[PDB]
Structures are given as structure tokens and as C-alpha cells.
């Protein structure tokens, strides 16, 4: 089963961050998306009550202008400033995008489910410049749903320019909606570390409710902070309130050239870091990561992680979502499709493209590109791939995976009937090369890749 280095990189990247299934990552038990979600919702509390699942909620929120007391005992109340208000509304929107929640602002003396306010001092009346924020779970008790932030932190005052402030808003709102931190730890109680993490996926990579940096799981965000819910948070909040199936149901583009009107899904130039888990409820969608020069690894599989713009594990696709297309940058990239019909564009650089199942359309772009086939099921005659920009003598088609059942023999213009043979057939009228592969144990020739252009036997890796 000696397969090529290009196939191996697809195989390995497909298994990037495998989780659950009795695995042990970082010496800890590995949780599936769902085991992580159940852990995060372990309080079993939402605005609809206890152990109430899949039920929507219509909630109110309020920027407090004054208080009689803060439920924690902290003092020195300061109301939200204009920037905090704007960023908090963007955080609320990132939650209502993914779950069946509506948020309506109230003012004056009206009560609200979720409230926002800052503090500056402790119960003793001394300045507190050390703490960050906290929030209270839904309930009927005094202060339920309230969230509180330390105004002496610049990131809290300036959440639109200091990424941790925006993440903190999203985080705190999550707690105010009923989500819990993955591990039984909390600010003020001793000194927890990633060694105190229940499961391996207890990190910023999987949930912004984690206390542990994305580096603990081998992700690397280079000092940036994701502003919106991450993959496990999306599953968790959907478990409580139901998924929002009205969101971005058109053809949506994430990354460069984005049409999402969401800052966390948008890169306006190559210096912008992207950190997101995408929720998308319909249509034909594209990951456009074309503006980066880093070597990237882009995986369109539901639940999978990508290494985008020189970061690691910074992009993921939520459970329940199908993203169809991907565009690499000028780096040497790996693009891995899913079972849907995908359009993959490597861009410049020497890229490895793997369409997987479905009828995919592949553009290697400038550079020495490799189009990888791991199975006869990747390109059946009934749903064949197109490779639309193949460069004879430059690009490669990798069929080394077929060695597992016997290395393919290249034949010139006829099959022998013995199987494990591959042929290139030139349609001169249309300038199309049909790559036919006859697999052993198939009575008909069932694998076809159509190529817009010429190809040579020496371009085919067997």
C-alpha cells in the first residue's frame, strides 16, 4: 500500500484533529462534537427552563444606565460606551445567526433577560484592574442573565479594536444563554490549568468558553482572538434553542470577497486573520482564501478544521453544514473536498486537490498541481470529475491509492479485460482527454475523469 506523498498528505489532513471514538489526545479523553456540547450545556438550563431542548426563545436585552447593586458585590458601576454597545450587538447577532433566538433591546425601567454593565471596584471599594468579566445563567433569580465587565481593562472599553473584548462579550452572552465552561473551573477559585481539562478539546480551538489557549491543542492563532461562537458552542447552543435554518441560505462567500456582512467571516486584505466556525443553512457556498500567500490546508468536510492564512486550526465547519467550493492562495495548498459536488481552485503555487466523492470541477491554477484520487468512488461515470485547466507535463493526476488492489497498468488504446488498467483517450473534436480507469472486479469501466486539455502518460502517477 505504498502510496505517494501527495495522497498521504490528503489522507493525513482528512484526519487532522480526529476526536472521540475512544481516542486520547494530549493524554486526555477525546470528546466528540456532541460529547463536548453536552458537557458545555451540563447545567441543563436555558431561558425555557431546565432540560428543555430544541425550543426557540425570544429574549430582551438592556444596556444598564444605573444599578442599585451588582449581584457579585463588585462596585463602581459604569454604563456601556458606544463602542461596547456596537460590539455587544454584533456578539448577540453571532448567536442569533446560529440558533433560534431573537434579541430585542429594551430601555428605561423595563426588565430584560440579558443585561450589560461594567464595574471598576471590588466589594471593599478598592480599584480592580485585574479581573475581566462574568455572567449569570438564565433563571428567575435576581441577576439571572446579567453580564458584567471590568471597565479598567482596555480590551473591555475598546472591544472593536482589542479582539479579546469582543470575544469576552460573545463568551459572557453564551453563559447568559445557558452555556457552561467545558471544565469545572472559574476565575477566583484557585488556579486551574489545561491539566485540569476534562477532555482534550478543552481549548479556544473548539469553544470560546474554554479557559485554555488554542495552542494547548496544537492550533495557533498568533495572538488573535476569535470573535464568534466556535464549533462546540454552535452545537451546544443549537441543542438548547434549535438551529437557525434561515441564515445565509443563498450562495455565501466566506473569507476574501465575502458577502456575509459579518466581520468574523470577512478578510479585507492579507494581513487580516480569520478565526471562525461557519454556520450556513443553504445554497452553494465558497471558502475564498485567495488573498493569502501562506501554504494553507482547506477541508470542506462538515466538522473539520482548516489551516488558513498561516494560522493553524483557525477555521472549521459546524456540524450540519455543507460548504461546496474552495479557493486557495498563492501558497502551496491542500484542498480537500467533501461528498458534495465541489469546485476547487488551487490558485498559484503547487497545490494538491482532492475532490472526494461527487462530481467535482478542479482548477489547479498556475503551478505544478496534483489532482488526487483515493477511490473508484471519487469519479464514477455517472458523476465524473472535470479537471478544467490541466497542464500536460506540469500537473499530475495521482492514482497511487489504487495500488492497494494492485498497481494500475497504463494501456495505450484498448483494455485487455484483466482490470487495474488506465487509459487516456483523446477526443480530437472537442479537445477533451477522457481518463478511463478499469478496476479489477468491475465488469464495466466505471471510473472516468474528463480533462479539458491534453495529458500524457507521464502525467499520470500510478
Amino acid at each position: 500500500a505504498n502510496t505517494s506523498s501527495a495522497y498521504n498528505s490528503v489522507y493525513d489532513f482528512l484526519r487532522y484533529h480526529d476526536r472521540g471514538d475512544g481516542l486520547t489526545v494530549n493524554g486526555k479523553t477525546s470528546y466528540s462534537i456532541d460529547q463536548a456540547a453536552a458537557q458545555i450545556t451540563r447545567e441543563n438550563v436555558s431561558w425555557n427552563g431546565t432540560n428543555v431542548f430544541g425550543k426557540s426563545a425570544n429574549l430582551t436585552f438592556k444596556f444598564l444606565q444605573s444599578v442599585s447593586s451588582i449581584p457579585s458585590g463588585d462596585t463602581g458601576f459604569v454604563k456601556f460606551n458606544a463602542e461596547q454597545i456596537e460590539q455587544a450587538k454584533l456578539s448577540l447577532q453571532s448567536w442569533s445567526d446560529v440558533a433560534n433566538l431573537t434579541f430585542t433591546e429594551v430601555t428605561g425601567n423595563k426588565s430584560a433577560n440579558i443585561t450589560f454593565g461594567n464595574y471598576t471596584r471590588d466589594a471593599s471599594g478598592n480599584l480592580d484592574y485585574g479581573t475581566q468579566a462574568y455572567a449569570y445563567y438564565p433563571g428567575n433569580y435576581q441577576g439571572a442573565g446579567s453580564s458584567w465587565y471590568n471597565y479598567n481593562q482596555s480590551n473591555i472599553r475598546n472591544p472593536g479594536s482589542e479582539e479579546y473584548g469582543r470575544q469576552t462579550f460573545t463568551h459572557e452572552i453564551g453563559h447568559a444563554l445557558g452555556l457552561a465552561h467545558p471544565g469545572e473551573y472559574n476565575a477566583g477559585e484557585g488556579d486551574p490549568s489545561y491539566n485540569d481539562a476534562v477532555y482534550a478539546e478543552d481549548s479556544y480551538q473548539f469553544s470560546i468558553h474554554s479557559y485554555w489557549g488554542e495552542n494547548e491543542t496544537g492550533a495557533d492563532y498568533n495572538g488573535h482572538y476569535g470573535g464568534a461562537p466556535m464549533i462546540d458552542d454552535i452545537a451546544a447552543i443549537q441543542r438548547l434553542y434549535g438551529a437557525n435554518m434561515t441564515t445565509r441560505t443563498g450562495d455565501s462567500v466566506y473569507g476574501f470577497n465575502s458577502n456575509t456582512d459579518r466581520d468574523f467571516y470577512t478578510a479585507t486584505d492579507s494581513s487580516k486573520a480569520l478565526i471562525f466556525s461557519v454556520w450556513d443553512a443553504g445554497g452553494t457556498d465558497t471558502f475564498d482564501f485567495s488573498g493569502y500567500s501562506n501554504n494553507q490546508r482547506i477541508n470542506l468536510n462538515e466538522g473539520s478544521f482548516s489551516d488558513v492564512g498561516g494560522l493553524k486550526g483557525n477555521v472549521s465547519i459546524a456540524h450540519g453544514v455543507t460548504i461546496e467550493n474552495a479557493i486557495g492562495g498563492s501558497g502551496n495548498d491542500i484542498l480537500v473536498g467533501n461528498s458534495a459536488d465541489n469546485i476547487l481552485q488551487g490558485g498559484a503555487g503547487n497545490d494538491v486537490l482532492y475532490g472526494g466523492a461527487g462530481a467535482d470541477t478542479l482548477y489547479g491554477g498556475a503551478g505544478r498541481d496534483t489532482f488526487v484520487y483515493g477511490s473508484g468512488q471519487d469519479s464514477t461515470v455517472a458523476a465524473y470529475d472535470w479537471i478544467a485547466d490541466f497542464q500536460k507535463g506540469i500537473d499530475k493526476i495521482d492514482l497511487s491509492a489504487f495500488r492497494n488492489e494492485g498497481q494500475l497498468s497504463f494501456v495505450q488504446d484498448q483494455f485487455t479485460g484483466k482490470g487495474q488498467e488506465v487509459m487516456l483517450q483523446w477526443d480530437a473534436a472537442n479537445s477533451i482527454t477522457n481518463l478511463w480507469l478499469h478496476e479489477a472486479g468491475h465488469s464495466s469501466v466505471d471510473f472516468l475523469v474528463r480533462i479539458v486539455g491534453q495529458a500524457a502518460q507521464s502525467d499520470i502517477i500510478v
Binding site: 447545567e43 449581584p71 462574568y134 455572567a135 449569570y136 445563567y137 453563559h175 457552561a180 465552561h181 472559574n186
Partner: peptide
């Protein structure tokens, strides 16, 4: 219950 409070998460800090």
C-alpha cells in the same frame, strides 16, 4: 450561578 456565576461563570467568571
Amino acid at each position: 450561578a456565576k461563570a467568571a
